[PDB]
Structures are given as structure tokens and as C-alpha cells.
Design a protein around this ligand. Sequence first.
Ligand code: UGA
Ligand code: UGA
Ligand code: UGA
Ligand code: UGA
Lengths: 455, 448, 451, 453
Amino acid sequence: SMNLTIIGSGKVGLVTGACLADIGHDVFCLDVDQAKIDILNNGGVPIHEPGLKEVIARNRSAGRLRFSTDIEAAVAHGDVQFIAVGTPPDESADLQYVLAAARNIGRYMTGFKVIVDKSTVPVGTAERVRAAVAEELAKRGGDQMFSVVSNPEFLKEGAAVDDFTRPDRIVIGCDDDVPGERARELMKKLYAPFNRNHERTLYMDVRSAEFTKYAANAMLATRISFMNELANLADRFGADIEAVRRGIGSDPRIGYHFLYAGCGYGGSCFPKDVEALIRTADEHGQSLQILKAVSSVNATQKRVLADKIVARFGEDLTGRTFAIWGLAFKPNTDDMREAPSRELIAELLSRGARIAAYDPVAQEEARRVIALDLADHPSWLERLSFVDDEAQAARDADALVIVTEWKIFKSPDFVALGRLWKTPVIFDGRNLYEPETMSEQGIEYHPIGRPGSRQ
Amino acid sequence: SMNLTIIGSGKVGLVTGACLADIGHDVFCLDVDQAKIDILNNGGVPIHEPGLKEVIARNRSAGRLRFSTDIEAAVAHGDVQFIAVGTPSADLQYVLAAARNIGRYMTGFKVIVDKSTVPVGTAERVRAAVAEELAKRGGQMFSVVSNPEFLKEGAAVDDFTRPDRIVIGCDDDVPGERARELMKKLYAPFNRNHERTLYMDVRSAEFTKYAANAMLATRISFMNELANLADRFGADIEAVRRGIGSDPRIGYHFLYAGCGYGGSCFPKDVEALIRTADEHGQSLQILKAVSSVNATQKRVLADKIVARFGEDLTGRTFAIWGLAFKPNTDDMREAPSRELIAELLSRGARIAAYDPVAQEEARRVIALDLADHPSWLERLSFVDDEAQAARDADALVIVTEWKIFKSPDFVALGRLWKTPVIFDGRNLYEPETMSEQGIEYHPIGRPG
Amino acid sequence: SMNLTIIGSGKVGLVTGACLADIGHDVFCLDVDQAKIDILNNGGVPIHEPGLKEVIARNRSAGRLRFSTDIEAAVAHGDVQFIAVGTPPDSADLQYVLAAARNIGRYMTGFKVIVDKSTVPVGTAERVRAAVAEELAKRGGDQMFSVVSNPEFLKEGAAVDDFTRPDRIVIGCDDDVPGERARELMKKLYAPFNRNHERTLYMDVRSAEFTKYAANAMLATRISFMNELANLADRFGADIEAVRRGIGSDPRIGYHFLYAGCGYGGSCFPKDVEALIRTADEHGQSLQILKAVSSVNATQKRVLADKIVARFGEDLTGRTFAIWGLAFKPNTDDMREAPSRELIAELLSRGARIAAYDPVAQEEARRVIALDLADHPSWLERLSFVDDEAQAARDADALVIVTEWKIFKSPDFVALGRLWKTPVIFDGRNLYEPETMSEQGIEYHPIGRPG
Amino acid sequence: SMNLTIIGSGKVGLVTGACLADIGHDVFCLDVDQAKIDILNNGGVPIHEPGLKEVIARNRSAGRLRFSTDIEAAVAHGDVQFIAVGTPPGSADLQYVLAAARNIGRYMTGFKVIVDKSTVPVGTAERVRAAVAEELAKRGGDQMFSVVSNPEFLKEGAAVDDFTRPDRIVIGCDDDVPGERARELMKKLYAPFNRNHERTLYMDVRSAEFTKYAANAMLATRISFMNELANLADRFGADIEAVRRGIGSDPRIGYHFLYAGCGYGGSCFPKDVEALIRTADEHGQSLQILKAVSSVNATQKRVLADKIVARFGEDLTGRTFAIWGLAFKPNTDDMREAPSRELIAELLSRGARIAAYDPVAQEEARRVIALDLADHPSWLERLSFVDDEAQAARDADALVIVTEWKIFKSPDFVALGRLWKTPVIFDGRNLYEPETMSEQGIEYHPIGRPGSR
Ligand SMILES: O=C(O)[C@H]1O[C@H](OP(=O)(O)OP(=O)(O)OC[C@H]2O[C@@H](n3ccc(=O)[nH]c3=O)[C@H](O)[C@@H]2O)[C@H](O)[C@@H](O)[C@@H]1O
Ligand SMILES: O=C(O)[C@H]1O[C@H](OP(=O)(O)OP(=O)(O)OC[C@H]2O[C@@H](n3ccc(=O)[nH]c3=O)[C@H](O)[C@@H]2O)[C@H](O)[C@@H](O)[C@@H]1O
Ligand SMILES: O=C(O)[C@H]1O[C@H](OP(=O)(O)OP(=O)(O)OC[C@H]2O[C@@H](n3ccc(=O)[nH]c3=O)[C@H](O)[C@@H]2O)[C@H](O)[C@@H](O)[C@@H]1O
Ligand SMILES: O=C(O)[C@H]1O[C@H](OP(=O)(O)OP(=O)(O)OC[C@H]2O[C@@H](n3ccc(=O)[nH]c3=O)[C@H](O)[C@@H]2O)[C@H](O)[C@@H](O)[C@@H]1O
């Protein structure tokens, strides 16, 4: 059992801190946003993460988990200091809060600290974190040493508590000098309870660990863009992208996962990380061709639903009504960041249509961000409504558009719907239904990468 | 037990036919190259495929496997006719020619199986050709089926008998559903544990084959770009591989950066898919990038070498370990070694190449490659022993990671080369092992 | 989308019915217990299964899931009829299964596919087939059917996850023409579970029936195997946990279910192991390994008392023991065959006072332990249940751990130090690292490790 | 790079020594059998291990691998001393291990790390420690050492692959100062095996010693487990192979080592399972599951004869049986504890003639069966060996398959039909699919499945 400090209280820090406490460590979770800290200390949780509330509560009442804004108390407490603060897009990749945390650790250090970069940060960030802390130690005459370590984060939004407790792997990057080898043993000790069956931890140098995180997200992004290009080609060949998915996923060298063509990828991670890796690379004088292509295919894909709609109803959608099913960038979250629904709704509104959107969870967040998106077009927002019931969105719709494959959308009341829409047309950005089931249900179906039914 | 005909006697047809026989079918293997057929009938095997000779022999002597050039007897024999001929962007002549013959001499209901890798919609052309030759005859029904091939060169017999999956594409009309049942019957012995077979429409089966090879190609090019980025960040591409392969969504396989991909399949298929797409008015951005990264990567060894010894390599000698496009084959098609050796030769160097298996094939293709430069060829030799290549070398270059190169006699070598320098296009050795062995190591995507 | 009927509303039927609905099927869930039906139709859930309430609710409001006691309506509804009723030892009581089978035969319209989901002895599907064919003969029936075996692989307390993301789905069918028809229907029904890897596994019905037993029997064998080695480790002075990692790292053996402790319990392993032994004796064969496995477990359930008696004496009058964990495993409230019951009885019989704690099974335990010990009112007066783990430790001579619920993994050893009489812990689950206990000043008695 | 000595030149020592050299260590391989040493120094290899010859050659010519009978030179050379000598019979014979230990103590210079590689009984490392500390007392020795357990997990005939790409490496060390020093040395030694996943697993020495036996005992249990269920399947009319797929698909159970058949043999499982049972009775505990496991195997080795006698009668005089497979498993020539030996004995004793075939073990089988049957010269005259699988079938009343060598998987059933007396096959390894046999006109008797006629 060790004393750990986590700096930052978002998905990464909140989950990491709570869960490391849950295995018997004494965790101090620090943040500067006093309201966030106040809310946590009053039994609330600022993020939609199944499991997280009960774990936080359990460990607070047990004396293992504390929330505060006391910077000095935080650095005093932990021998291991996790940097888990955010990294906002710039112009790409804003290191200010990370370096600020690093500075404070250097400013008030007593003895040997292990400083862990948990937040997703660009290769070499750990050297800047080391330079910042070594300096604040020079302004103090410090014969106290430290090592910076890379321990990236692999949590999926809305599945973060499971992903943390039952990880595929744990990546640790350490220097092989003497401080580094000391920090390494401490990480070994810290993560022991995760290595009791298969050995889940994976050791490397810090620059490799930093890199790994980006490459991992970049490959997952490539897989998706890959299938999306092929899906648009399938429409031309008359093939079925879903048959092809089973077809190539059955080769264990490729695997079955993340090959789901649709209306593109969004969220707080892929687009940021892909972009950041492309920039870093251009800055080192290298042009990532494949990743550049991957990023371009996605920007295009986010426009595919509008294209299909415009191709079917015309350039001018004045007088049309579209039901939108699903707003969040993926199911089981309320995160609207980079969500395909936002680009879709904008295009449609701009061409004169009325939109009735439904999402089991993201209604509020969507209303907020889409209002900001469209600030310069008040008159568009007047043609956008949110409804409380999936079927209600369909009232007088020329078509229903599915953009996030939430479970409730998989088995709808097609008869109740038949009584509501103007025409039984569905555009499907996630391939939820089997075309010929749609055909027999009398529905004009427009999937992505498969043949439709159109009757 | 059914009677099958296989048309074509290269890797795909030879292995397919022999192996389908070995499970009790009566296989007629047809080809027009009489010499090939003569060789097979005299116990020889025109391809380097472990296992294949014994399987062919076993089944010939058992009366289940026959080789001939008799077109009509072939068509007469098989109720299922596999088209397994070659496809030299994307030349359909031999496939259509086989299709015609089947139409020309058909008796009853045939199931025609496109096994050879062919572009989406090829099965409709094969259907049109055969229906026509049936109209010149007042004709009996048939269905064209897609059943792609997933054999790795040099491991083809294993890959056929214990497949990951079997892909079958059929129409859902009544001929098509009849062909389907026949395929079900034919492949029954492969479905006795897990159900290995996967049914779909024919255009999707055709597509699957290309997408699969294109995804594999992407994974490689992907890691190669990252490898060249690692060199700049000072990261270790191999650590990264472990780092991202441990995510089961990504997987551990085909993430080996190096000097690029080669051979008779990836380059052809990736190019073919790009063309077909442009022809349908779509530009595959990712795949084009993937193809461009590989053309570049095959030049990476030369670049590192020129960066270290200069633009003019006159008076240098390089040892080349590995010629074949990958280990455990003798196939020199699209092999990185060919681009490397050309570049080096063109800048004045002497080359001594070694490969456990491909020496003859390499000598042949490299002579053709460099026909216009006789004087280059005079500076190229092949040797019989890996260490001999090293005699007076300024450096040793590893381009194919055959097993014997994994544990070399670094002392014997030390007695032979001019300077202990190794460029490594496959990342065989651990850098610090090389450092302690006194060796100047240039890996791909790692610190040296 | 098909119309399915599920007969029985316990773990197997409730979860199976709700979850098959959730993928778009129209499910009629039938049971005779009107109170159970009434509770379900009023938004309640008679079992502790995470996920299950929301899935039931979701699908009721969507018109895909219905609960009733109307036998005839149930048979009329489903073309596929799941028998998921219970099978109470005896050894192995088929009455409710046969009774369900009869009703199906009694009111059948057209071709039915009858699916034995409940765990039933090899050849049960022939008895189900005989029962239904007869009721059809009392009716002059030119309607056909096939009986199918589709065993269940749900873990209590993880049943909803286990159903939706299964290792494999086992289907056993005849290869006559009715059977091959039922097979296609099962293929159709289970399609959505085969979209990545092919999860479904076809075989004959007797082999399917058998598989279920052999699967539980092999898991039981692994545990009893490690338990015997654990008691051997105490003699060699080795560490059973080191050995577990030692042999678990061979992929032929694997890492799971090798956790020695105070034995196995619950509503499945003991029943199924016993059943398979009986069936075998009835077929003139003595399963030696399984018999040994069963005997090792009966012994292991006494190990905690033995260790305790060896330390404090044959007469425990004047001693007090804290009991942490009552349920047969963590994350359930099921007290069936729970080691804690044999432990608590032994200890009470020798004069001790017991204070037991469990985060979930308090009520269930109080109920079953009262029945266990009905002949011994005076024993029960020496048994209390407490609401807070630490409270159990008040004046305890030792703390005994019998179910490794997560909250027990990181306890307040100082708070405890202020409460117990002596810092002694007997550990039936190996929760703690011995030398951590040593430095914490604690006299630790694990199973199969040095203390 | 370290200097290592390996004591003993059998599978364990030969492979270990050669392969540790192959990663750059300087290996001295010691043995007392001068002929064995002579054969190795002349490019020969006393064991059937694919890959081994080339590795040995490679490393000899490179100056990293040496074979000798010079005891003192051996002790002088290695700072790490692997005990890899044999452990024969009585249960579990420690004499050669203790003798090696003594020599190490007799001639030690500085700090040695002594590694018990050979499979030895729990607490053997204390006896090795006692023996060496004593020989140091007869010499007045400051010099310290630590005994370490590093068990072996090689499969016979696959030993080179299994060594170089291991599932895990098990190391047991004391946690005193000598022990922690030996631990670091082992960490250093095995580093090149930990560059991807960390393959090495540290524990105390008694647990390491135990691990080795439990691992074999669990593998043995799985097999006997399936064999009992196989015999129960015959009664229920179920298919044991369907059950295998049925329970293998549960990742908690896994797919491996669930092949019912005519039992387990070889130089390891029976020895180790027996040893574990004895040690246990000696510590006053009766291993019930293991005892049953051992009992089920002894019985299974008799199943083929039982099925044959049930079919043709108590008296097999005038019958002839083809035997396909002799080695205890495929890809080896090891006849130890092979099921074929118990089968052939039974059959011969009832008057039958036997024609046996094996692609590799013919010589070794002739030798051991002759010794098994020394007291029955007349039996051996009714036993022949043949060079071609099909020749065994000449006039056979039946063909019996006991080792599932690959060549048996696709036989010339027509060629055979022209040779045997009746088309009858008893299959102790379940090679063929029953209904394929049925259509081929063959009376098939598999283990734990329904047959034909
Ligand atoms: O860096 C991070 O923090 C995390 O980023 C991602 O997680 P996240 O963005 O929350 O969720 P994903 O499940 O990756 O969703 C990505 C987007 O791709 C889309 N997608 C996903 C899969 C697919 O097959 N097709 C597809 O379009 C999803 O709808 C979603 O919009 C990764 O999945 C995590 O492993 C990583 O730790
Ligand atoms: O279409 C076909 O008939 C076959 O082509 C390919 O196989 P192949 O070209 O024989 O050889 P691979 O083993 O795929 O290797 C191709 C190239 O990839 C390179 N490679 C592979 C993996 C890797 O990580 N890095 C890498 O550079 C190899 O050096 C090699 O030159 C596919 O792997 C087969 O599944 C397929 O059936
Ligand atoms: O037939 C059934 O319905 C189910 O029965 C069991 O599930 P369950 O009864 O919930 O309990 P398990 O999780 O199997 O645990 C069995 C007992 O063995 C004990 N055990 C388990 C694992 C172990 O390593 N050691 C050990 O002592 C557990 O504490 C528990 O008391 C099986 O695990 C399921 O696979 C099966 O579907
Ligand atoms: O202690 C040792 O030296 C070695 O002993 C065994 O290896 P081995 O003796 O070569 O034989 P195995 O391949 O393990 O099989 C042994 C016997 O079990 C039989 N077997 C195996 C698996 C199965 O499902 N059924 C079965 O009958 C084999 O046919 C053979 O008779 C162990 O597999 C290795 O872990 C260990 O390193």
C-alpha cells in the first residue's frame, strides 16, 4: 500500500484515483476547479461513468480517497504523483496544464518523487516535464532526485471503470538510470495486483511508451477509415460491406474488431490524437501519408448521410422534416465532442429542413453544443427541436436518420412509426438492420456500404 | 465424395487439387503447359511447397489424382470446375479462356468456382462467356461461385487443410442455391469442429479477398511510417509493436516494420484494387498512401547506406543476407532485395549475396532486371555460405529474416569483414547485444 | 424475429427470456407460481441479478416480454418452447420438466421445437419426447416436433453478461428431418450471437446433455485438485499460490479456477457432481476421479473448524468468532451449500459465540441457518448477525474469512485492533499476503500457504 | 555473457546447454559416460531431438560449447552450475544428483550458483545444500553459495522449440543474501527471454520444486478425467470428442490435453505422478484424486485388449493383429511406459501373432519388448516388425492404432482392403470420423465414440 496523488479530476484522473484507492492505496486527488472538488466531496460525479460513483463513495468513507484543491498538501502526500490533467487542441496539443502541474511538484518537493505522465501527451513531453521540475529544484538548491515515467491510459469513455480494473495491458516507460530503475520497481509494486494471473504489465523506455499511446489510437482510426473507404466502394461494386467485414475479420491476423463502417469516428480522443500525431510528424519533417489519408476519409464520411439525403430529396430541403436518432459520438455516453450528428444536423438545417432529434442521454449536452455551433444562424436553431421519445421524432418526417447505434434503436415499433412519419424512409449511418427485413417491413432503407431495398 | 476438376497447376490449383483429393474426392487437374503436366506425372513438383510432393504422390497412387492437358476430358470429368489459373492491371484472359472451354463442352449442370484472385464482378464476365458458348449450342444450367484462396506461399498445404475460414459466394436463385449445397457437401470435412465456412453473395466474396490483402498491406505500411517517425522521436518501433499489439482490437500480427512488403500477391492485389476503384470513379486515399509508403521503404536500406558511406560506393563491398521476398520460399517477385541490389550496384559497389534457397531464382531475375547494365552484373556475385559473403565487406545488410540469420558466428565474421557494420531491414537482433559485440548496428525504427 | 415461450422463471428462464426478447423476439414467460408472476408484472425481480431489472423493464414496455400463469396461452404462443424449470435433488428430480413437457403435448397446434435448457441428466430429452408423443396419441396428432438440448452456462450473479456475451452456445439435435428443422430454427434464433467468431456448437442431443455435466465436473475437479495440493503444501512448507501461478502459466492448464480455499458451494456444482456420480452408478460405472473430487470437498468444508479447534481446543465455550462472508461466493446472496453454514454449525456445537457479516446475504443466511439448526435452539442464541464488518470483530478470539467479497480485501486493521480480543485470522480464501499480515502484527492462518 | 556448466547430457542437459550457448554463453557440458561424451565430440547426437544437432554444431565451432568428462575442470569453469542429471529407480533416485552436488562442493573456488534443473522431489534442494556445505566443512571453506530451483518444461521431441520459446521460466530462490545474489544472476542469465512479455516467474525454492510435479499431475489428471468420461460415453451413447469441444470452449477449462485414448505413457508423467503420490504418503497424506488418476490410466492401457478379446474371444490363437504406432507418443522414439507394450504383451499371451509398425521406434521397441517378454521366448516368435505400415495388415483379423503419428491419418484403405482378412480397426487415438469409416465399409471401434459395422 502506497500514498498516491492524482492531478486532474476528469475521466482519466477520477477513474484512476478512485480505482487505485479501491485496491488499498491512499489516494489524494487534486484539482484547481474548486466547484468540481466541491461536487465530488458532496457525493456527486461530474462524469457519466457507470460504476464510478459507488467506487468513489466506498473509498471515501473508508479513508482511502480524498478530494482537494490544496496544491502543497497534494505534493506533500504522494511519493508517486500522477499527472492526469487535460490536453486541449491549440493553433495542436496544449501542454500548459501539464507543465504547470510539473512545476508545482518541483516547487514544493520533499524527497524522491516518481512523476507519472498519465495524460495523453506528445513524444518527448516527459523530457519537458523533467526540465521544468529540475529547474524549480535549481531555484531551491535541491539534493532530492526524481524520475519521470510514462504510463498512458487506455480507458474507453463510458466503460472506464471496467477498462481500468481489467486492462488488456499496462504500459510503463522508464529510464534505465538509477532513479529510473527505482521508479520502475515502485510501479511494479503499485501495479502488482493486476499481474496475478497473466502478466499484464509491459515495460519499455519512456519515449516508446509515449509513442505507443498515439500509435494505438492511430491504428484504431485507420481500421475505421479503411472500412469506410471500402464501404463507399462496395456501393459501387454492389457488394455488402458487412459480409466483407466477417470475411476479413475471420483472419486472426486482422481480427474482428473496429471494422464497423458507418458515418465516421468522433469523440474527445481519436480526432485530437490523430491530428496531433500528424502535426508532431510534420514538425519533425515527416509527412504521415496513411494517417493523413485516414483523417481525410473521416472528414468526408461525416458528410455521407447529408449527401445521400440531398441525393434523394434535392439540394433544397425547405419543407422537409428529418428525425435524428442518436446524438452522442458513440452509444453509452453523453459526450458530443466531434460527433457526426453535429455535422449532419448543421448541413440539413442549412438547406432549410426541420430537425427533431432524440438521444437517450445526450439531449442537454447536444442542445448546448449545437447552439454554440450554430450561433451565427439563430434562424436555423428555430427549425431544430429535441424530443423525449424516439417515436415522437418521427412525427411527419420525410425520413428517419440513425447516427448513433444505441441499443434501443435495434428493435423499434415500426408500426407505431408507420402511423407517424410522412414516408417510410430510413438512412442508416450505423448499419443496425438487415436490409431484407427492412424490405419486407415496407421500408425504403439506405444503409452505408450495403445494398438497400428502396421499397 | 465428388468428382472435381481444377484448372491451373500453380500454387493455388496444385495445392487445392491435391488436398481436396486427399480427403477422398476424385480430382482431375488440368493445365495447357504440357511440360508442367509431364513433370507432375513423373513425380516432380514445379513449386517449393513443403508437404506437397508426398500428398500428390499418395493421392496419385491411390487413383484420386490425375494430371493432363486434355481439355474435353477435364470438362467431362468434373461436376464442380475450379478455375485456378493465373492473373498477370489484372489480366483476365486465361480465366475467361477456361470459362469458355467449360461452356464449349458442357454436358449437364456444372458448378464453376472462381478460386484465382479476380476483380469484383469477374464472376459475371465468367457467367456471360459461358452462357454465350451455350447459346452457340442451344443449351443445361450452371452457377458461378466465388471461393477465394487464402494460402501463404511456402505454407500452402498447412493453410489449406487447417484454414481460418472458407469463403463461399453464391447467387440466391435456384441454380445458385444448388451450387451452394454442393459446396457445403464438398467442404463438410472442414466443418466438423467449429463451423469454418462463411457464406455470402459472390460480389462480396470477390471483394473480401482484395480487402483482406489490402488490410494486411496497410498494417505493414502503417508500422513502416511509424518506424521512420520513431527514428526521429528516438523511440523503439518494436516496443511500440508490443505496446499496440496487446490491444486485442488491434492484434499482434503483421506489425513488423522493416524494408517493405514483396511477393506475388500484396503488390499486385493492392495495385489492382486501386485501379478498379479509380475505374469506378473513386480514389482510395488510404490504399494509395499504403502503396506509396512501401515503394519508399524498399529504398530505405540504400538511403541509410549512402548516408553512411556516401553517394559514390565505388570501392565498397556489401554482404547481402536474404534474397527471397520472405523466408521459407524462393519466390523473388517484388523482392526488396532486388531494388536494394540495383541501387547499390548503380553507385559502384560490389555485392556478395547469400540466400539458403533463392540463389538460382535471384541470379536469373536480377540478370533480367539489370540487362541494360552488363558492367553492374560483373560486380555482383552469389556465395554458398552466409559467412563468405562477408569477406572484405564494408557492411553486412540483412533483407530477409530466414532463421539461420538469427544466430550467426560473430567471431568468424569478425575475421572476415572490413568493418563490423550491419544494416538490418528486419530487426533480427537486440541493439545492446550488438553494442556489446562491438558492432555498428543500423536497425529500422529503433535506436542503433 | 420469432415468438418464444420460456417455462420457468428462475435464473435460467428469467434471464434467458428477458435477454432473447432484448434482441427483438416476442417472449412469453410462463410459470405456475402466481406470486412470482405477480411480482414480475409489478416491476419487481425475485433474484439478485445485476442488469436484469432494466432489461426486463425495457422489454415489457416495448411489448416484447410478458409474464403469465396461463398454460394454454403459453403453448399457443411459442413455436419454440424453452423448458427452463428447476431440477431439485432427490438425486435429480424430473417431475417439473416432465410436467412442462406434458402440457406442451396436451395443447399443441403445429410443429413445436422443445428446448431442454434446464440442466437435466443424459437421456432426459428422450423422456421429454416420450411424454409429448403420448399426449399426442391421446389426441390423434399428425403434428410433429423435435426435442433439442440447449444447456445453460450462466454464472449466478453474472447471468446477464454471461448470456449476452457467451463463450459458446451448445445445441444438440437429432439428424432426422424434424431435428434438422429444429436445428435451422435454432440457427436462426441464435444468429445475432454469431456475427464475429462463430459461437455456436452443434452436436447430437445426448452429447449436449452430457457436456453440461462434464463442464461442471471438470471445474469442480480443478478446485478439489488444488485443495488436496493445498493441504499437501502445508506439509512440504510450499506456497499453494506460488504453485497456482506455476502451473497456470502452462496454457494447457490455464490460470482459472485453481483457487484453493474452504471448498465449493452453491446451487450447481454439488448437485451436478452428485447427479453425474449417481447416473453413472446406475449405468454400472463408478466414476473414481469424480467420487474423489466430491470427497475432497466434503472434507475441505471442515478445514476452517479443524484449524480453529487445533488452535483453541475441542471446547470453544467462552470463545467468540467473527465470520466475514456468508454467501457461497461473492456477488450473490445464494446460501445453498455454502461453506459458511458447515463452519458456523461446527463452531456453535462446540460452545462458541458467532458474529457473522455479509454485505448481501444477511437475511438469506439468518433464514437457512435457522432451519439448519432448528433442533438446537440454544445454538442459535449464540449466533448474531451484524451490519458492519468491523462490529463482528468485537471481543473476537479470531476473525474467519469464508467468502472473498471485495470489501474484505482492504480492511481497517487498526480499527480492528481496537475491537478483537486477539489478532488472529483464519483465511479460507487467501485474501492477504502472509508477510503483510506479519508486519501488521497478525497471527495468520491461510489455506495452503505458510502463516 | 556468463560461463555456465551443465551436468548431465540427456534431453534436459543437452538441450539446455546447447541452447544457452546459442544465446552467447560459454557452456561446459559435463558427463561421466565417456562414450556419450565421445559421440557428441564426433558430431553425433544420442537423442531424437529435431534441431539439436545443428545448434550443437553451430555452437561448438563457435567456441561456446564443450563436452568433457573432466569433473574438476567443469566445477572450475562455471559460476552457475546446472544439475541436469537423471532421476531413476523404488520411487525417485537422488544418487546422481547428490553425487554432482558433492563434486561441486569438493572442488569449489568462489561463489557458485547451483541450479536444480532435473525434476527432483520437494526439499531436494536442501539435501543438495547439505551435501555441498559439508564438503566445504571438510575443507574449511569461507566461500558461499545458493541452491536454486529452475525446473524444466520441455516436451520430448519438441525440446529445442520449447526451450527457446517457453511459456514461462520458473525460478525458486532463498531470500537471504546469497539467494538474492543467485536470483540476480538468474535474472541476468535469462534476460534475452524477457524482451517481449516478461516470461520469468520468481518464487521460493520449495514452491518451484512443487510446481513441476503439480504441473505434470494436472496434465495427467485432465487425460484420466477424459478417459473415464470416454468409458461413460460408450454407455450413454454419447461422443467423447463432441464433449471435448463442448467443454474445451470454456476458457476456464481450455482445449488442450483433453484427448481420450488408450492412456498416457513416457518417461515423465507416470514417474512424476507416482513420485508425487509416494512423497505424499511419506508425509502422511493420501492424494485421492491423483491416486484415482493413476488407477484410471493403468486400466485404460488395458482397454484395447479388452475390446479385442470381447470381439474375437479369450483365445486369440490363430488371429493376427496389425499394430500401427509403438512410441509412447508421436514424433519420438521413446518406448518408456508406452501403451503399445502392455497391448502387445496381452495379445501375445493369448496366442495371437503381431506385426507392428512405427516410423521411428522400431529398433527401440524390438529392444524393450524383448526385455519385457524375456520369460516368454515363444511369444516373441509370434511378434514381427515391418518396414511399411500396409505390410503389417497382411492377413490381419484387425488393425490396432495406438500412436497417432501423422502418416496414419490418411491411409490407402483400398491397398489395405487387398491385404487384411477382415476390415476391422480398433482405434486408441480417435483418428478417423466414424461415418467416414462406415462408408468405407470398415468395422470401426474408437474410444468413447459410437463406432460402426
Ligand atoms: O485515448 C483514449 O482515451 C481512448 O480513446 C478511444 O476511446 P473513445 O474515444 O472513448 O471511444 P471509441 O470506442 O474509440 O469510439 C471512437 C469512435 O469511433 C467510432 N467507431 C468505432 C468503431 C467502429 O468499428 N466504427 C466506428 O465508427 C465510434 O462510433 C466512436 O465515435 C479508444 O477506444 C480507447 O482505447 C482509448 O483509451
Ligand atoms: O493472395 C494470396 O494468395 C496470399 O498472399 C499473402 O501471402 P504471401 O504474399 O505469400 O506472403 P506473406 O507471408 O503475406 O508476406 C508478404 C510480404 O509481407 C512482408 N511482411 C509481412 C509481415 C510483416 O509484419 N511485415 C512484413 O514486411 C513479408 O516480408 C513479405 O514480403 C497472404 O498472406 C495470404 O493469406 C494470401 O492467401
Ligand atoms: O451450472 C450453472 O448454472 C453454473 O454453475 C457454476 O456457477 P456458480 O454456481 O455461480 O458458481 P461458480 O462461480 O462456478 O463457483 C463455484 C464454487 O466454487 C468455488 N471456487 C471457485 C473457483 C475457485 O478457483 N475456487 C473455488 O473454491 C466458488 O467459491 C464457488 O463456491 C458455473 O461456474 C457456471 O459455469 C455454470 O453455468
Ligand atoms: O516433465 C517433463 O519432462 C515433460 O513431460 C511432459 O511431456 P512428454 O513426457 O513429452 O509427453 P506429452 O506430450 O506431455 O504427452 C504424454 C502422454 O500423454 C498422452 N496424451 C496427451 C494429451 C492427451 O490429450 N491425451 C494423451 O493421451 C500422450 O499421447 C502421451 O502418452 C510434459 O508435457 C512437459 O510439460 C514436461 O516438460
